Structure formats: structure tokens, C-alpha cells
């Protein structure tokens, strides 16, 4: 009795009974059955294709007498990516799935349990890499063989772990050299078409699980003609696959056969021909699911109702729109009502939270199988501008008459659909009437030209040329646009969405031309659609209005400015990389970067880790009683003090544009004021980018150490005048000159100042014992001391 679409054993141990009629579960097997009442009193060898849950099953200590004969968890579907997760089980002490041979799809996750190493999960699941448990020290893993009994179960090694078993009751077996990957049998092999196991060596009808689909008692690799591969373990005839209407995991009214299988849905870009599961029609628009909702009729007057549809394509009903409340919800609906591709009816009013229905950028067409009174499959009282962006999204209404009145939305948007959508005369001229429709908003509105586009450092002084009646003022110079893909209704103001940054300056009374100042324009960008806001009445419908063209004042924004995120770094000795970033303010199109670099003064010239060992500073809040107090001191000091205030030459290099560069031919070891200057398109005209970072060239070793050896010379008072040469170009400066000396080895050490050294021509030792001695000298450079001089085995005398 092939169980049929999965199992959800719930409530008590008495639901296990249903597994009596479950030979192969063509779905999942979920076992909270917390009842010690029974334990191994529900044995079902019958069960021999998706995830199997094992948790909160009080009484179950081993499944040896629960699901015997488990061929292979086919794992087709996985709750997450596992098909046998045993976690926090009430009292499972052994998995006891002795026959478990494979996990064809995905993996499993046995882990921390009540009382649950031998099992080669790397054989069942190719490479155990599962969260495989309760103390492994307590395991006491001992099945017949690995215990005092002579080897009974099969043996294998994994990551150096040779062991002998699913439980201490039964044991484990696995496909030997006979086959390996291809199924296996009790030391014989399985059928070409067969994975897991066969009831008889190499036989189509013996195949226990079949490698692909056990069609009507024979393991077929592909389903015969007029039959289709049930996604699981067996293959079924065309009638069964289509006649099945629903069963939990089962849902399709006829699993629409596609993807070379009796599959509930079809693969990307395929839609069930009418109501025929037989095959699927290339959609070209991947369908998440038939978007239909239990409720045939469907309205979107709430942003939550818009979201209820999200994640789908072909609905079977309609999509009325009535969202009155909503600002910028343009984005909300772009995400929500921007997936539905088809509907079997229509998209219908009173919705002032939508400038345009561009949010529906997925709705390619509209069928019309269901209609309204007077077959209106309609816009009334919605005061919308462009319907479904007809410039770059045409639709079609197979069965639906248009209706457009009281929408002050252009009548032309629908006079276009007469031909485009194919509604030439489905409706009457009174349905798409001009009275009340498009009386307000703006369509005919003339496009004014810009008379001057003056562009300073951060000020656009955009100017223009007179509405129907001159009683009309406020000249919104709506500004915002690195790209040229922008309109006027991207986001007008409140009802028309919001994005275009509104600005304003009044038109001066005939001489004196209007000249707004968008002072503080975005540095590094240009759009400037100067729309004329007027008074629409008296002429009322004859009031044309205005909407100046969207120039992107193409002057590369404004002009050259402070670079940013500069990262100069000495990449080599006497070298300095100047990798930066496309500044946050180049103010143009990043032409090149003049690196500018150049006072080494003589001031230095004349000169639980550890368990029981640290301390408890867990009182970091009490350490912040003086640390946050430091921050209080910061306010009275860092808000008032210098706010009142409101040697070498320079060298330059115009870097091509690439972020990286280098500054070679520098001094052995010197800091450089590595300034950055993004000289842009018009730097020669409007100043070269407000200037930095500093870095020390890596020390060119050779001057770090003393260039020569030492000359010990006998001197009176048991003294020894040593000598050495000065590094030619020291790494910064030889602050001190270390000097080592002593009898057996150079035990003692001091350091003569560069100044004293220059006057002495070296340095003088004193009071050394008459006999053999040894000395040395080092150069303590600004970067750091180098190696010592050659050996100076000397000798002193008192007479």
C-alpha cells in the first residue's frame, strides 16, 4: 500500500498505526508523540522518499521494530537541507535504521539527543559533511563484532576511523566492491537502473527503491509513453498523475507534467496549457505559482492587500485597486504589485496614493475570463497620471470594456489602448469620457526651454522665458541624477509619490528675468526640470499648464574639488604608492590626480587568555566613570578653543586616473606630505581640487648600518680611541652611534652622539685591563639601528 503523499504523525503513539498501510512513503514522515505508553509496539517492515523527523517521541529507544527495511531515504525534498534530523529526542538511545543505505538527495543531521561513530555516514551520505551528539564519551558504541562478539557488521574507515552499525540490536551493511555507486544486494550486484538495493540480483522488478522511477513493477530510467515520472521512487500512468487533485504535498489539479517528470508545476518559463496537465506552454516569464487566491474576487485598497499577492504570476480572478492612503508607497507596490503577469479577469478607483501604475512592471497582459456588471474588466475618482507605462509596457484586455471618468490620468492614455490593448470599441465613448477626466493634473502643459544654464562652483542659475492668464508665480525648479533615465512623475509631491527634490523662487514682475539659485547643488552630479506651478481655474480645462524639459545641466556637475579617502602607503624603500578612491567630491568626471609631495628638522640630531594572572576589569562601566567623564571634559574643550580660528621643495605627477600609483626616487627614510589633487575637466578654469595623507618611505637599508669597520687606536689612561665612517644618506638621521666593547666578548655598550663623534673623529674607551679585548660600533638610524661594524679585537696597556 504505497503510503501516498507523505505523513504528519501527531498527538499520540496511536497515529503510528497508519504506517501499517505505508510500503513506500511518496513524501515526508514527521513523528510530539510523547507517550512512554508504547515504544517498539508499532513495527512496520512495509516502510522501505523525503525528510523523516524524529524528536519528542517519549518511549522510542530504537527503530529496529518501528521502520524496518528502510532502503534509502531518497531525500527528494528537504525541510532545510537534511532528510533524517534526530535532535533533542525524548529518549532515542539508538538510530536503529539498520537497512539505511543512502541519502540520494541532500544530507541528514543527527546531533545532541537524550542518550543517542560506528555508522559510516560518509558511505550512506557521500562524505558525512551532518552535525554528528550527546556525550561521545558516554556513547559506549558496541554492536556485535566491535564488542566481545566476533566481527558481525560490515567494517569501513573514514578520516582514519576503522570501526564495525546503526544500533547494538541490528548492525549496518553497505555496497561492497561488487558495485559501489550502483545499488547492491545480499555479495551480488543490482540492475543497471537501480540505486540503494534490489530484492534479487540484477532484476528490473526486484529493484527495492529503483535508481529513478519504478514504473508499474519495473525500474525504468524514463517513464514510458502516456506515463510520467512521479517525483519520488516509482513511475505512474498519465491518468493517475493528472487525476490526482490534492493530498497535502499534492496540490496541482493534475500535476502539470513537465521538466521530464510528472511534476506539480513546470520548470522556469512554462504555463499549463488551459487545464491540460499533459504538457506546459513556454511562458518565458518564470512563474513562482498560479497567483490565484481562494477568494475569486480580489481588491488592493490596502498596502497589506498589495503584499498578499506578492510572489506569483497568473491569478484566476481580478486585481481592483482602491489605495487612498499611502505616500511614496510607489516602492511598496513596486515590490508588492510588480510580479502578477496575467489574471483571468481584470485590474480595476478612489486611489490617490499612486501617481502611475508603473509599480505593475510585470503585468504583461490581462485575460478576462471573469467580468463585472456591464462587463467592466475601470478607473473612477482615482486622481493616477500614466496607467501601465505605455512607452515601455503594453498590455491587452482579451475580455474587458474600459471606463475612465472623474480621474483628473490623461484620456489619451486609454485612447492609445483602443488600438494597443485592443479595446477599440469594447466600451462606449461615454465610458472613457473627457468630461471630469484629466481636468486637473497636467498633460498638454507646454515644455519651456532654458534661456541660460550658468554654473558657478556650487550654484546653478537656471533661467527660462507666461501661462494662459498672467494672474499666475512660484517657479518650482525641481532638481535632483547621474543617469539621463528620469521623467517628471518619478516622485512629484505626496499624491504623486516623492523623490524629485522640490525647490522654489518667485518669477519677478515684464523686465527682470526669473533666475533661481539651486545654491548647494550636489557636488559631483548635475537634472533641473523647471516646472511652472500656476492657478488652474476660469479657463479650468483650457488651462494648459507647463513642464520645462529635463536638462541634466551637462557641465560635469560643477567643477574640481577636495579629493577623499586617499590611502598613501610606502610600498618600497624610497617609494610611495598613492592608492585613493574616486573621491566623494571630485566635482566632475575624475580627469587625473596631481600627487603633490615634499621639513626633517634637527631636534633629534642633538639627542580565557591567562586563567589566573590578570585582574577583574568587568567593572568597565566603573572604568567608564572616568572614561565617560573624559568625554564630558571633551564637550567643554572640543566645542570651544580653536573654533575662534575659523627645508625641501615640492614635486608633482598627473596620475592617469587608476586609483593606484607610486612616488619613487624619494630619500632613504623621510615622511612626505603626500597631498592628492583631483584636477578635473575645468581645474585650469575653476581651481585644482581642495588639497592629504603622510607616510615615511621604507628605510633603504645600507645607511641603517655603519658603512665601514672600526679603527681601535691606543690612548693614555688605558684608553682606546675607536673610529667609524658616517652613513652617507642616513635613514632619516643617525640619532646616536652605539659602541660595544669588553675583554672576553663586547660585554659593555654605550652610544656616542653624532655631534661628539664628528668632533672626536670616533669615540674613546677608558680604564680597560692590559690584555686582549674586542669592540664594535652601530648606526642608530631614525627608522632603527642597523647591523654592527666588522670585528675590532683590540688590546690596552697601562705602560
Amino acid at each position: 500500500e504505497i503510503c501516498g503523499p507523505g505523513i504528519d504523525i501527531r498527538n499520540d503513539y496511536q497515529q503510528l498505526k497508519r504506517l501499517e498501510n505505508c510500503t513506500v512513503i511518496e513524501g515526508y514522515l514527521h513523528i510530539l508523540i510523547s507517550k512512554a505508553e508504547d515504544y517498539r509496539s508499532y513495527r512496520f517492515p512495509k516502510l522501505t522518499t523525503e525528510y523523516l523527523l524524529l524528536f519528542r517521541v517519549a518511549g522510542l529507544e530504537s527503530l529496529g521494530d518501528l521502520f524496518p527495511n528502510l532502503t534509502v531515504i531518497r531525500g527528494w525534498k528537504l525541510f532545510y537541507n537534511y532528510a533524517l534530523v534526530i535532535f533533542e529526542m525524548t529518549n532515542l538511545k539508538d538510530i536503529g535504521l539498520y537497512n539505511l543505505r543512502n541519502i540520494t538527495r541532500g544530507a541528514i543531521r543527527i546531533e545532541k539527543n537524550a542518550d543517542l561513530s560506528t555508522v559510516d555516514w560518509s558511505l550512506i551520505l557521500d562524505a558525512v559533511s551532518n552535525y554528528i551528539n550527546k556525550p561521545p564519551k558516554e556513547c559506549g558504541d558496541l554492536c556485535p563484532g566491535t564488542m566481545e562478539e566476533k566481527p558481525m557488521c560490515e567494517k569501513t574507515t573514514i578520516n582514519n576511523e576503522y570501526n564495525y552499525c546503526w544500533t547494538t540490536n541490528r548492525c549496518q551493511k553497505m555496497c561492497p566492491s561488487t558495485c559501489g555507486k550502483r545499488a547492491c544486494t545480499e555479495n551480488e550486484c543490482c540492475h543497471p537502473e537501480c540505486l540503494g538495493s534490489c530484492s534479487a540480483p540484477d532484476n528490473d522488478t526486484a529493484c527495492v527503491a529503483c535508481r529513478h522511477y519504478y514504473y508499474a513493477g519495473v525500474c525504468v530510467p524514463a517513464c514510458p509513453p502516456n506515463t510520467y515520472r512521479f517525483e519520488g521512487w516509482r513511475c505512474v500512468d498519465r491518468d493517475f498523475c493528472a487525476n490526482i487533485l490534492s493530498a497535502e504535498s499534492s496540490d496541482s489539479e493534475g500535476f502539470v507534467i513537465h521538466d521530464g517528470e510528472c511534476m506539480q508545476e513546470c520548470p522556469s518559463g512554462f504555463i499549463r496549457n488551459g487545464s491540460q496537465s499533459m504538457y506546459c506552454i513556454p511562458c518565458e516569464g518564470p512563474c513562482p505559482k498560479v497567483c490565484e487566491e481562494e477568494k475569486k474576487t480580489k481588491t488592493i485598497d490596502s498596502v497589506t492587500s498589495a503584499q498578499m499577492l506578492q510572489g506569483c504570476t497568473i491569478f484566476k480572478g481580478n486585481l481592483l485597486i482602491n489605495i487612498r492612503r499611502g505616500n511614496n508607497i510607489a516602492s511598496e507596490l513596486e515590490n508588492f504589485m510588480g510580479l502578477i503577469e496575467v489574471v483571468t479577469g481584470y485590474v480595476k478607483r478612489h486611489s490617490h496614493a499612486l501617481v502611475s501604475l508603473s509599480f505593475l512592471k510585470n503585468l504583461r497582459l490581462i485575460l478576462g475570463e471573469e467580468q463585472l456588471e456591464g462587463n467592466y474588466s475601470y478607473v473612477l475618482d482615482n486622481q493616477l497620471q500614466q496607467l501601465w507605462d505605455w512607452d515601455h509596457r503594453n498590455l491587452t484586455i482579451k475580455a474587458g470594456k474600459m471606463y475612465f471618468a472623474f480621474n483628473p490620468l490623461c484620456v489619451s492614455e486609454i485612447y492609445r489602448m483602443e488600438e494597443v490593448t485592443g479595446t477599440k470599441g469594447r466600451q462606449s465613448k461615454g465610458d472613457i469620457n473627457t468630461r471630469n477626466n484629466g481636468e486637473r493634473a497636467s498633460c498638454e502643459s507646454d515644455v519651456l526651454h532654458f534661456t541660460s544654464t550658468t554654473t558657478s562652483k556650487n550654484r546653478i542659475i537656471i533661467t527660462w522665458h507666461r501661462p494662459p492668464d498672467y494672474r499666475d508665480i512660484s517657479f518650482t525648479v525641481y532638481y535632483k541624477a547621474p543617469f539621463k533615465n528620469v521623467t517628471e512623475y518619478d516622485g512629484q509631491d505626496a499624491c504623486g509619490s516623492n523623490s524629485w527634490n522640490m525647490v522654489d523662487v518667485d518669477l519677478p514682475p515684464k523686465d527682470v528675468e526669473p533666475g533661481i539659485l539651486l545654491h548647494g547643488l550636489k557636488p559631483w552630479t548635475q537634472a533641473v526640470y523647471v516646472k511652472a506651478v500656476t492657478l488652474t481655474m476660469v479657463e479650468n480645462d483650457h488651462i494648459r499648464g507647463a513642464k520645462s524639459e529635463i536638462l541634466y545641466i551637462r557641465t560635469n556637475a560643477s567643477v574640481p574639488s577636495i579629493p577623499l579617502d586617499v590611502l598613501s602607503a610606502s610600498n618600497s624603500s624610497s617609494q610611495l604608492i598613492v592608492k585613493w578612491n574616486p573621491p566623494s567630491l571630485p566635482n566632475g568626471n575624475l580627469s587625473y590626480y596631481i600627487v603633490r609631495w615634499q621639513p626633517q628638522d634637527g631636534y633629534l640630531y642633538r639627542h580565557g587568555p591567562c586563567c589566573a594572572c590578570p585582574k577583574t576589569e568587568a567593572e568597565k562601566q566603573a572604568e567608564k566613570e572616568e572614561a565617560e567623564y573624559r568625554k564630558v571634559f571633551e564637550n567643554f574643550l572640543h566645542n570651544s578653543i580653536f573654533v575662534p580660528r575659523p627645508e625641501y621643495p615640492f614635486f608633482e605627477s598627473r596620475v592617469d586616473n587608476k586609483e593606484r600609483t607610486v612616488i619613487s626616487n624619494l630619500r632613504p627614510f623621510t615622511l612626505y606630505r603626500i597631498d592628492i589633487h583631483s584636477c578635473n575637466h575645468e581645474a585650469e578654469k575653476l581651481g585644482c581640487s581642495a588639497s592629504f595623507v603622510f607616510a615615511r618611505t621604507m628605510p633603504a637599508e645600507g645607511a641603517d648600518d655603519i658603512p665601514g669597520p672600526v679603527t681601535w687606536e691606543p690612548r693614555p689612561e688605558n684608553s682606546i680611541f675607536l673610529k667609524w665612517p658616517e652613513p652617507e644618506n642616513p635613514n632619516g638621521l643617525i640619532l646616536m652611534y652605539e659602541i660595544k666593547y669588553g675583554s672576553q666578548v663586547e660585554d659593555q655598550r654605550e652610544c656616542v652622539s653624532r655631534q661628539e663623534y664628528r668632533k672626536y673623529g670616533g669615540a674613546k674607551l677608558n680604564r680597560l685591563n692590559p690584555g686582549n679585548y674586542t669592540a664594535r660600533i652601530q648606526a642608530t638610524s631614525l627608522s632603527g639601528n642597523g647591523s654592527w661594524t666588522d670585528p675590532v679585537f683590540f688590546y690596552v696597556q697601562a705602560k
Binding site: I562, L564, D565, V566, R630, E634, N635, L637, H638, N639, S640, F642, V643, R645, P646, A690, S691, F692, V693, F694
Partner: protein, 44 residues
């Protein structure tokens, strides 16, 4: 980020030796600032 006593030596470098409570310790340190506005705390 730049504040504390390190920001006092930081203003020493940007200003050289030439010469409403949110300040440079409440901006260069709070968010992030370069050696351009850090040296705007100096004279010309």
C-alpha cells in the same frame, strides 16, 4: 574617527604652528573626517 588626546595632536599636524555643543570631537571622532576639515580648525 578622530578624538581624545590624539585629536589634539591631530589638530597640531593639520594646523602646523601657523597659530550647538557638537564640535570636532563630536564629528571627526563621532563619524569620520579627513585631513581637510580637521585643518579647517586652523587660520589662513
Amino acid at each position: 574617527t578622530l578624538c581624545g588626546a590624539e585629536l589634539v595632536d591631530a589638530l597640531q599636524f593639520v594646523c602646523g604652528d601657523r597659530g550647538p555643543q557638537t564640535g570636532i570631537v563630536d564629528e571627526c571622532c563621532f563619524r569620520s573626517c579627513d585631513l581637510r576639515r580637521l585643518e579647517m580648525y586652523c587660520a589662513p
